[model samples]
Target: MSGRVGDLSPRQKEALAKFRENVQDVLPALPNPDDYFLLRWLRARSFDLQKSEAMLRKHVEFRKQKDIDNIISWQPPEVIQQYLSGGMCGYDLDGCPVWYDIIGPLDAKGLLFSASKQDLLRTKMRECELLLQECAHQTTKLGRKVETITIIYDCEGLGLKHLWKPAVEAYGEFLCMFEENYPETLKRLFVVKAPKLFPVAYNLIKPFLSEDTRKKIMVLGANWKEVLLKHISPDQVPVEYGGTMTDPDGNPKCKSKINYGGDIPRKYYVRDQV
Candidate 1:
């Protein structure tokens, strides 16, 4: 479970040392990092000294640009916060936090009309930071190295409407940001209940994803329920996905953990205000 320093070959160790020295100027200010933190950057860049060094340096700059270190303290506007659907429900078999992204019912048009693209992007970034926090907590809870998250993407109701042009572009921006700034953080992405047209949407954002990341995604088939249970325990899977867990209200969607997004009201749309 450990992304152990001892596991690295001597040559890789040399590069890590050089990488550390190169990025030393901003290292002290980097947010709550663990033993595997520096290695994550190196691995992301395939241990190329120049590339890794620049990537980490640029990452620091990007954090400052976005104020990512303080993202925990910042809150998105209520409209965006409530409309963006995703949340961490439970832990996977490996003690990695399991996050559910209920993408189907998201009214992307309504979201864009209600909030600026930046608002939505920042909200997604905040979600990433929150997942990172959860990973850190899992490390403490299980006494293991827990650095990544397992995502369950529910695409049951997805369709052409979800792929509106402006919405797709906005989504691409977020995808690019996540891949660039949050490298090597995804343990797995299980796409469940994916429809026949899922590839159309996937193709839209596929270019933004790294090869390493693409490899980690599993587009589940008809037996997705059984496959999900293989990596995640029955209790951890939500009732809607064929698991035993239900909200206290006996709701199957696990409303407490997953936000099943609905349409944004016309009053919330930015254009209507003017």
Candidate 2:
């Protein structure tokens, strides 16, 4: 919708028209919705205008109250790459966008204490925005009618350090943020290679997540790769992780297997630039 866009089937087209008309009074004040996103809201509510309008309104209020657009404008700290990396590896077998996250390698300490809780959250939100932008780019590039993605999460490297109270709380906040602002965007989540202690951490925090997200998460253990290979091909998945997704032939298809777990230079002040 940013530049090139259109074409909804009869039902989808009708849904869009009805949604626009129902929200006409608030349309001018709402965040602009592209075809893909408008569909995300409609589908999230099963194409019921009453529910869709409510969901859209709540999304707008949060964006305004959080000044989310302004918050999303700043560039993420380079350190964020160390704290988090891996995105848009390639299109999944289903033709939707695919995102991969190697979570175990990141040092939770570096991220939790990167700044204050608020700054830490801002940095986290910025990363989410970055990923969403990539999803939009792919939706337009492939000329898809909808925008959604499946995530492959490698849980091998995570441990106690990541459960620090402040970091844990921020993680909870982000989960809610994603559910609220990003509903229906996440198609599924494949959590693989988890350690024994993963469940302990998950159970402790699971109550904070919405039912929608809880249903989407699939935690796997030793057979993780086998299960993952069912939905993702070896060619699109990273070789080391069990799939064959590679780099630009010469480059690392992804970040180093794990973050070295270091700190960012002082140059990045965790300044609230967003």
Which candidate number would show the highest TM-score if scored against the true structure? 1
- What's the TM-score of each model vs. the native? 0.95, 0.75
In lDDT terms, how accurate is model 1? Answer: 0.86
Candidate 1, residues 106-194, lDDT tens digits: the string is 99898988888887898888889999999888989889778899999999999999888888888889989888888889999999998
| Candidate 2 structure lDDT | 0.68
Cα TM-score of candidate 1: 0.95
Best prediction by lDDT: 1
Predicted candidate 2 versus true structure: per-residue lDDT over 40-145, tens digit per residue:
7776676788888898889788777767777767655566755554555656666666667666666555555455566556665665666677676765677765
Q: For each candidate, C-alpha RMSD in Å?
A: 2.1, 5.6
Residue 170 CA displacement from its true place in model 2, Å: 1.0
Which residues of candidate 1, in runs, are more than 4 Å off? 1-4, 272-274
